[PDB]
Design a protein around this ligand. Structure first.
Ligand SMILES: NCCN[C@H]1CC[C@@H](Nc2ncc3cc2C(=O)N([C@H]2CC[C@@H](N)CC2)CCCCCN2C(NS3(=O)=O)[S+]3C4=C(Cl)CC=C(O)C423)CC1
Ligand SMILES: Nc1nc2c(ncn2[C@@H]2O[C@H](COP(=O)(O)OP(=O)(O)NP(=O)(O)O)[C@@H](O)[C@H]2O)c(=O)[nH]1
Ligand SMILES: [Co+2]
Ligand SMILES: [Mg+2]
Length: 160
């Protein structure tokens, strides 16, 4: 049975841990790695998800092992959005490729204290050649979509 190593990265407090727990428990949280078997497009797989912190050698190891990365920012935190550059650069450096499966996730979509426009994040994701999904760990909106889209990007990459 195919296994996918997924890595959830992003600045402190964007909701990396909250998104992972929503996928795993279907509950909003008020452990560093999780397993979950799912069917996508008629194919069973085991998701092996790493919840990271917002050490340069351990960092390099998960960026090497990871097959797909959820690059998470919070819509109410512009620094966390600007920081996506840094996570992407680090991953591309370690993987020696401009082509790494990634999805840009704008979390906390439920919040009215919004400082990052959907259009801004859409255009950046277009520049990176990656999908963009807005999610809410609080309400579970698009959380499965974010992780499943990332699995579909890994499968698309595996064709190339
Ligand atoms: N969010 C809390 C912070 N947690 C981070 C998690 C990331 C860092 N820890 C690790 N980073 C990488 C590795 C092991 C550990 C590492 O040493 N840990 C331990 C896990 C036990 C304790 N909670 C302390 C930290 C994190 C869990 C590693 C899980 C195995 N693993 C991997 N192992 S590893 O490459 O040897 S790598 C990986 C990917 Cl990519 C995808 C799915 C996986 O399961 C993966 C720093 C601490
Ligand atoms: N309103 C709202 N708050 C959320 C959302 N996701 C997470 N939070 C809140 O944001 C804070 C940090 O969430 P957490 O999941 O710990 O973020 P993290 O990125 O894992 N943090 P760290 O990098 O420190 O490990 C918590 O108060 C959590 O409840 C969301 O979609 N909406
Ligand atoms: Co740079
Ligand atoms: Mg966390």
């Amino acid at each position: 049975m195919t296994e996918y190593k997924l890595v959830v990265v992003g600045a402190g407090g964007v909701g990396k841990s909250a998104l992972t727990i929503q996928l795993i428990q279907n509950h909003f949280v008020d452990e560093d790695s999780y397993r979950k078997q799912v069917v996508i497009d008629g194919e069973t797989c085991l998701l092996d998800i790493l919840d990271t912190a917002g050490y340069s050698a351990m960092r390099d190891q998960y960026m090497r092992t990871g097959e797909g990365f959820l690059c998470v920012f919070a819509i109410n935190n512009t620094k966390s959005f600007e920081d996506i550059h840094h996570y992407r650069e680090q991953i591309k450096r370690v993987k020696d490729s401009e082509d790494v499966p990634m999805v840009l996730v704008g979390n906390k979509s439920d919040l009215p204290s919004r400082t990052v426009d959907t259009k801004q994040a859409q255009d950046l994701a277009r520049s990176y050649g990656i999908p963009f999904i807005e999610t809410s760990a609080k309400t579970r909106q698009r959380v499965e979509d974010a992780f499943y889209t990332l699995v579909r990007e890994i499968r698309q990459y595996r064709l190339k």
